[model samples]
Target chain A: XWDXAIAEYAXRIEXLIXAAQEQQEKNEXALXEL
Target chain B: XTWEXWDXAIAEYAXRIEXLIXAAQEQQEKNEXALXEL
Candidate 1:
């Protein structure tokens, strides 16, 4: 299951979510750091 | 890039052996849940 793999894949998911959130937060520090 | 969304991105590709066997999955199979940029 994807949920089961979440721990093992935390690094990957965090990386992806971080990248997406980073782009979303671009040039704006007030936005949530996610 | 925002052309379409694939329902299940990583899992669907897991079954696409033709794409996986050739290691061509990433380039083409990295479809978004939303076509629009996050």
Candidate 2:
């Protein structure tokens, strides 16, 4: 049987990508609000 | 200070991005290179 990467790995990837997006958005908003 | 040197520009970022996969992959292909090094 092929082993699929556990959901936690995908969750981590999603969380990371979301965090990066949030971070970029925060920077952009901060620059705009400045 | 990317204009200062090569290591500072790419090293850390490369390490972060390649760290996991490099351990998984074989490192024997010395002739192969990054970007256009081949």
Candidate 3:
């Protein structure tokens, strides 16, 4: 249902942001190591 | 930058979902009215 799907959007976005930020941190670490 | 914008995406998508369901309901209402008119 759209309701369920809509409810998931927030969680999905939160997870996506967390992953993106984690990757960004890793990239920064790699940049520092290089 | 993108991290900050992520919440905006969530809001937009939620709004879009509501709009789509509203449109679907409106279309169904129109169809029922047409059926009744026929």
Candidate 4:
């Protein structure tokens, strides 16, 4: 059970990082357009 | 690694997740500020 939980958390961490990076990129682009 | 270390391993994993959460929130805040500044 602990192993499974760790695996789940590992994926969630990556998901957050990937989403945050993409969102931040768009934010950066918008800021530059101003 | 030993099964005895599972206890410590979980703590490390917990910290890893929390750090990522904080980073995600910080990124969101920066995006908000970026929009406001723009």
Q: What is the lDDT, from 0 to 100, of the residue B3 in candidate 1?
A: 16
> Residues A1-34, candidate 2, lDDT per residue (tens digit)?
1124335344445555565555455445434533
The per-prediction i-RMS, to one decimal, reads 12.6, 16.2, 19.2, 4.4
Question: Candidate 3, what DockQ?
Answer: 0.04
Best by TM-score: 4
| Superior by DockQ: candidate 1 or candidate 2 | 1
Worst 10 residues of 1 chain B by lDDT: B25-34
User: Considering only N, C-alpha and C atoms within 3 Å, which residue pairs clash in candidate 3?
Assistant: none
lDDT of 1 by residue, B1-38 (tens): 32123325544443553343334323223333223344
How high is the TM-score of chain B in model 1? Answer: 0.22
lDDT of 2 by residue, B11-35 (tens): 4444553453343233222222331
Off by over 4 Å in 2: A1-7, B1-38
lDDT of 3 by residue, B1-38 (tens): 77447658877865665565566556555555665676
Candidate 1 Cα errors over 4 Å, as ranges? A1-5, A27-34, B1-38
Q: Over the full model, what C-alpha lDDT does candidate 4 score relative to the true structure? A: 0.66
- Candidate 4 stretches with Cα past 4 Å from truth are A1-34, B1-4
Model 3 bad stretches (over 4 Å) = A1-34
- Candidate 4's docking class is incorrect
CAPRI docking class of candidate 1: incorrect
Fraction of real interface contacts that model 2 preserves? 0.00
